[model samples]
Target: ILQFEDIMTNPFYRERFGTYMERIDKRALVGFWESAEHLKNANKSEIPQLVSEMYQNFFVESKEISVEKSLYKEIQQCLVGNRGIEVFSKIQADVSEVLRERYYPSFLVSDLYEKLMRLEHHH
Candidate 1:
């Protein structure tokens, strides 16, 4: 099995694995929180342990996951397809609409609803 800490803390793997690391930004952190909540619901106890291990690896060992260049690229694509791309495409409309509200207060809810309807028409 892949080590949790290695995957999480390593810049190479984090980006490759699609773990958006800028958790200090409020909008970014909301994404992080949602991810954490999803993981907690999915993995429960194991997820917390994995997160702790990641922090320890980052702060204590300063270690990273080293993979062969070709393998890394392949795994990166696989991870994106399995986790990042698939999930984002699945939830893009709902997530985009939510963000639109935050970014566009003057835009009425009906306008947003119509936009979604237009998107549905395209599909």
Candidate 2:
């Protein structure tokens, strides 16, 4: 009765927005916070190391260079005001869906996704 799509929708697969409104549990959110912090603090030469640390903390095995490059460009677009925040928000959902489809476990994925749908964010 379980579907892959359902599991992919789970809140556990979703990224947390901040300290208070976390849907993905505290530990996981802490990991993301660490990566976000490093990203915020990193300079040009320190970027690769920061990125690698983020990936490692997130339990991601490999960085798809092309995907990272593409995302970076997309992020730049949002940062420079070329794309609206809504654009990035929609893209984030799409990206989250992809990750959920590929990486989430079967049984709890859908339940987690349902929780995700109900989660609140700061903005």
Candidate 3:
């Protein structure tokens, strides 16, 4: 299974990341790149739209509305040449760093984490 799949199964993670998880797939990106199909002939497109949805879901319209305005300039700078998987990958990588820094601290100290570790030790 994918790393997202693994973490999502943990009820705690679902309540958090799963909220915006639905918007990351290819279906949402399919339409965003259609404007380039002005001379429509079934041309190929995916990366830009994928990154667009990822950016919109994770940053632009994320639940963190209070910070959206400040994020606009930062996001725009990162997406200046927005057309590749590298951009979104970098975005998600930075996202992981913060979640690890802020989220993991609390989780690691929780009884749930302790219980999970105890079970593994017994095994």
**TM-scores, each model vs. reference:** 0.25, 0.30, 0.40
Task: Pick the lDDT winner.
Answer: 2
For candidate 2, write residues 39-83 as lDDT tens digits.
655676775565456545543543332245566576557555474
Error of 3 at 47 (Å): 3.5
* Model 3 TM-score on a 0 to 1 scale: 0.40
Location of the lowest summed lDDT over 10 successive residues in candidate 3: 30-39
Positional deviation of 42 in candidate 3, in angstroms?
Answer: 20
> How far does residue 98 in candidate 3 sit from its true spot (Å)?
1.6
lDDT score of residue 52 within candidate 2: 52
For residue 20, give model 1's deviation from the true position in Å: 16
lDDT of 1: 0.37
Model-by-model lDDT, in order? 0.37, 0.43, 0.42
Clashes by residue pair, model 2: 7-110, 9-113, 10-112, 10-113, 11-112, 11-113
How many clashing pairs per prediction, in order?
0, 6, 0
Comparing candidate 1 with candidate 3, which one achieves the higher TM-score?
3
**lDDT, candidate 1, 3-118, per-residue tens:** 43443344443333332222222234234324433444555456545444433443235323333465445534634343222322223344334434443233223344345346
